[PDB]
Amino acid sequence: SQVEHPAGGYKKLFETVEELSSPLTAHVTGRIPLWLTGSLLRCGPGLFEVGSEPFYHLFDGQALLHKFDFKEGHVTYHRRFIRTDAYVRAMTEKRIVITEFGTCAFPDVEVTDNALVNIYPVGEDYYACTETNFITKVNPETLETIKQVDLCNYVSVNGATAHPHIENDGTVYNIGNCFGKNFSIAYNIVKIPPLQADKEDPISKSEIVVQFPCSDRFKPSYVHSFGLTPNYIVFVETPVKINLFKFLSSWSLWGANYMDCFESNETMGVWLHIADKKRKKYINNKYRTSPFNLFHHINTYEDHEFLIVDLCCWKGFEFVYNYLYLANLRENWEEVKKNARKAPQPEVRRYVLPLNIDKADTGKNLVTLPNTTATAILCSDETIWLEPEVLFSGPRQAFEFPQINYQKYGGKPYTYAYGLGLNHFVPDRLCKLNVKTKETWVWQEPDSYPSEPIFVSHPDALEEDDGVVLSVVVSPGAGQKPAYLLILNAKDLSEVARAEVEINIPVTFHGLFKKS
Amino acid sequence: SQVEHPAGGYKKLFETVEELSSPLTAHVTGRIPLWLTGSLLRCGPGLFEVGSEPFYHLFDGQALLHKFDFKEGHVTYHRRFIRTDAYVRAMTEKRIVITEFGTCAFPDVEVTDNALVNIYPVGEDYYACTETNFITKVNPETLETIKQVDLCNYVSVNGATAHPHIENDGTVYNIGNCFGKNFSIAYNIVKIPPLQADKEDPISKSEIVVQFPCSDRFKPSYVHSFGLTPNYIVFVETPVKINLFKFLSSWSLWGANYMDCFESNETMGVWLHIADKKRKKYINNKYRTSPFNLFHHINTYEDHEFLIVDLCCWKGFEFVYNYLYLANLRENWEEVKKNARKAPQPEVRRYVLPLNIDKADTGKNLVTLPNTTATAILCSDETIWLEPEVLFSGPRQAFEFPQINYQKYGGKPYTYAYGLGLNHFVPDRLCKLNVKTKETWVWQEPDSYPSEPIFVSHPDALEEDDGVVLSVVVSPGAGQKPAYLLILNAKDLSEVARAEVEINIPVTFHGLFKKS
Ligand SMILES: [Fe+2]
Ligand SMILES: [Fe+2]
């Protein structure tokens, strides 16, 4: 049947913790491999209340930057709150000052800079980020907060995702919502160039490369991530909409938060879009398919005349984020299950977009690749109806937080995807998926709740899966240490080692491994 | 990669054969089980030309009734052409007289009674059938043709499928196209009652039980089969349409055949319909989903408040029957493959229809069953958007001609489905599919091309798969006998025995096993 969680240990993923004064030596069990010399940096919330006022949604709690360090054999753990404008004001004024995603702030309309979602490199720097216009620059070694950076000073966007794409030369691509800034209502592709010899901040030289068109102008789609290949940029327009009439109004005048501005569009489905990366030009192929929520691309790549697009989908048009309020996630296990019964259903899908479309094949399947069941029907009005190839589909068992051997196989033909397993939204197990043969591997322990797994290649790696997978696990229960870092081999998802700590660690969303 | 067929042996599936004067003793290899005492009756074409005039489509060749007999250990094979109006006229006049599906008949507009598709029991009788109004009554023991029966004399339908449902008490349900007969344009459910004590022909007492509504009145959907449970009747309206403006016109005046009257509707998708079987009432739940060709239901059943509907689908709206012309199917193997590259793609899908729809759950997934990833989204306009649970999906590898333990598990909760494997439309292997765990089993030999597998229960059967699977295999190649009957165990799909014959046997579509 299932894997259950009567103990309710997952509630401690959403419990406030305190930062550290300096790094804490972690109790290693097993052999930490000697080639693993770097620093696992991850972001997540760590303050779910300010005094009596609580934060209501998963994505409201004040951002906390975590660092697991690896050197020779040893491991250390450190964490500091990011001194954001939201945090410092909250801490000094002793209440929720800045309005978060799901937690409106009472006075005793400023955009939150609460960078709890991810962290990525720009030039010599590293910015923690949420999905707004404010990215916060942080010190990766000391976890100190350096400066708040406003993208509105450099590019014409209202926000940007927490999932930008980093090319090997350090060039950063990202996608952002634009709500009429510079008279344009669209989705824009920001390009931050790599650091030059003159050492000028890349951000200062950032630019918009290409503009994806909006299906409904007054209701743009929510965008969490996008696809990138050597030649093409994929953007997936979902039916989760942001109602601008509500989003661009005096929020305090009706006690609104960002969530109150969302709507699902029942008739649209999902529109898929393509842009030539190099020519910087939007391609006008009308790719259409049935409705789903989309948050994370697994990977994207060119294969003969086709773009292979692998998505972690949630079936249906209800905003999945409705089921991610902290009230719900801290309920007991039979209620967590009961709540997600009517939720969108998670499925890994491969979508295959044909890049050139012959008029003579109208009414026919264009997807002539030999190794897929994915379909693309050219219609008379020139829409191209796609059906997926399902890669993984389990009942309320979501392969989410996808991760791959990014540096070497990102944007390119690949075979393996590592992921976090959401069991009715409680993170629960770590997964590996072979996208060619649909085969899987699972790591799992009772009352142990892991985070996104990050891949870290062997220096002499020949295979795609020659490396290890790092995960932050929260293991409550008497006797056992409250949390640990988990080092899994990427071949078996077999355990290599554990760095255990004395203190709780809450949920963490995304991160990176910084080599040295 | 693939299983290949350079030899081109499959071409002999579509080669004319000659009937027999009396049964032929078959060379048994292995142990034919002694409980297997009955008669495997199957229909298919066996005359693909009349002199110089060829038949063009797979479904045009003149119907041939095959009989494998089993008694104690021994096996005999017999086959006779069905003396249809199409056949007798063709044979006497020495040319194609009656127009077939894909072969228009030149004069020197009568509906074909060419019953090549299947054969089923009504009362004490057995009727061979195609999909028109003319079913031909045949003798199951001698394979003699008895009489042509016109359903237009008893019920208000234009045709009826070759896949009617037979309940254990012998009651027959079938679905038929109605083109304005009795002022109604619909799909009708015919019910032939079981034989009574007064011994009156059931057909004479047949009646229409319920009328399913038509989406486009001037273009009705092609219907090959339907779903049946103790309480409900499922009908799947596809976008493969029959254009009546073309279908109801003087065909000789522009040399038409049935195929020239087909069209694919690009915007409709697939509409699913439900009827209360017992109250004989159409239920007005607007079940909608993405486009596909549908030919054979696997099975249908009630599970709590939901109908579980398992379909053998072909993704897209192009009429699959376009790729089933004899010119194509008799090409060499690299061309067979090249032809099916742009064809609809085969997939086994589970669809879950909720039978009661709460208005309060608008915009949400209603499918609250614990063991599925299938989805039903109630919309505002009261359409219910469904997404499937994929059960099997391989690239041009079709699980088709589904068959189950019908007598005991038809219309009810079940686990196993046996099928024929279409490898770019060439029938190729026999499959078994566990619908609960997606697990499969395959039987296969090079240059051996089998037919639909029929299940035959052990007299003391406790399990669902306690029995054998019968298949007619055509094995060309020097040294080997040209064809044989195959007896597979239903547990492993392991071989039990072979009844080999000295002569070729062409393709066969559907049939039954007659116990005694
Ligand atoms: Fe994310
Ligand atoms: Fe059929």
Contacts of B261-264 with C-beta under 8 Å, sequence gap 24+, read: B262/B222, B262/B319, B262/B321, B263/B219, B264/A363, B264/B239, B264/B240, B264/B317, B264/B318, B264/B319
The structure tokens listed for B214 are 């038509």
B346 bridge partner residues: B314
Runs of H (alpha helix) within A348-466: 406-409
B264 CB neighbours in chain A (<8 A) are 363
d(CA A10, CA A476): 8
- Between CA A46 and CA A163 the distance in angstroms is 21
Query: CA B9 to CA A158: how far, in whole Å?
Result: 65
- The rounded distance, in Å, linking the Cα atoms of A464 and A363 is 39
Q: Do B318 and A363 touch (CB under 8 A)?
A: yes
Give, in order, the Cα–Cα distances in Å from A124 to each of A167, B115, B504: 15, 78, 76
Torsion of CA B288, B290, B295, B298, to 10 degrees: -70
The residues, ordered by sequence, that sit 6+ positions from A139 with a Cβ below 8 Å of its Cβ are A126, A145, A146
Angle value at C-alpha A144, between A141 and A146, nearest 5 degrees: 110
C-beta of residue B241 within 8 angstroms of C-beta of residue B219: yes
Q: Which residues of A touch B340 (CB under 8 A)?
A: none
How far apart CA B288 and CA A510 sit, in angstroms, is 38
Q: How far is B353 from chain A (nearest CA, A)?
A: 14
The dihedral built from the CA positions of residue B250, B256, B257 and B258, taken in this order, carries a sign that is negative
Contacts of B367 in chain A (CB under 8 A): 345
- Inter-chain touch A345–B393, beta carbons under 8 Å: no
Residue of B nearest to A396 (CA): B373
| Ligand 2 centroid from CA B151, angstroms | 19
**HEC string for A43-66:** EEECCCEECCEECCECCCCCEEEE
Structure tokens at B362: 């608008």
- Nearest residue of A to residue B380, measured between CA atoms: A266
Of A363, A379, A390, the CB nearest to B393: A390
- Rounded CA gap, A325 and A333, in Å? 15
Q: Give the bridge partners for A208, in sequence order.
A: A190
- Among partner residues B342, B370, B372, which is closest to A365 by beta-carbon distance? B342
Whole-angstrom distance, CA of residue B451 vs CA of residue B430: 8
Q: How far is B278 from chain A (nearest CA, A)?
A: 30
- A100-132 b/e (C-beta count within 10 Å ≥ 16 → b): bbbbbbeeeeebbbbbbbbbbbbbebbbbbbbb
Gyration radius of chain A's alpha carbons: 22
Looking at beta carbons, which residues of chain B come within 8 Å of A373?
Answer: 315, 345-347, 393-395
Which candidate from A317, A366, A379 shows the least CB-CB separation from B266? A379
Instruction: Consult the annotation and say whether B165 binds a ligand.
Output: no
Task: From chain A, pick out residues whose CB is under 8 angstroms from the CB of B314.
Answer: none
Answer whether B387 sits within 8 Å of A345, measured CB to CB: yes
Spatial contact of A118 and A162, defined as CB atoms under 8 Å apart = yes
Calculate how close chain B gets to A300, using CA atoms only, in Å.
Answer: 20
As beta bridge partners, residue B311 has: B297, B349
B305 contacts in chain A (CB < 8 Å): none
Task: Give the residue among B434, B429, B432, B405 at the shortest CA–CA distance from B486.
Answer: B429
Q: How far is A470 from chain B (nearest CA, A)?
A: 29
Pairing relation of β-strands A240-242 and A262-264? antiparallel
CA of B149 to the centre of ligand 2 (A): 20
Q: Report chain B's C-alpha Rg in angstroms.
A: 22
Cα atoms found within 13 Å of the Cα of residue B123, Cβ hemisphere only:
18
User: Nearest CB to B345: which of A264, A341, A365?
Assistant: A365
Resolution in angstrom units:
3.0
Q: Which of B266, B345, B365 sits opposite A375 (nearest CB)?
A: B345
Report the residue of chain A nearest B363, measured CA to CA.
Answer: A318
Residue B440: beta bridge partners? B433
- Contact: B316, A368; criterion CB under 8 Å: no
Tell me the nearest-neighbour CA distance from A373 into chain B, angstroms.
5
* CA–CA separation, A484 and A494 (whole Å): 16
Find the residue in B nearest to A393 (Cα). B373
Order of all β-strands in the sheet with B63-71: B24-25, B74-81, B63-71, B38-45, B510-515
Mutate to test the interface with A, among B238, B304, B345, B391 (most CBs of A within 10 A): B345
Residues for chain A: how many in total?
A: 516
Which technique?
X-ray
**Contact, B488 vs B18, CB < 8 A?**
no
Binding site, annotated residues of A for Fe cation: 163, 224, 296, 510
CB nearest to B365's CB, from A342, A379, A381: A342
Residue A117 CA to ligand 1 centre (angstroms): 7
Q: Tell me the residues of A at the B interface, defined by beta carbons under 8 Å apart.
A: 1, 264, 266, 289-291, 315-318, 341-347, 361, 363-368, 370-375, 377, 379-381, 385, 387, 389-390, 393-395
Minimal CA separation from A321 to chain B, in Å: 13
| Contact list, A377 vs chain B (CB under 8 Å) | 291, 316-318
Backbone angles phi, psi at B10, to 5 degrees: -60, -20
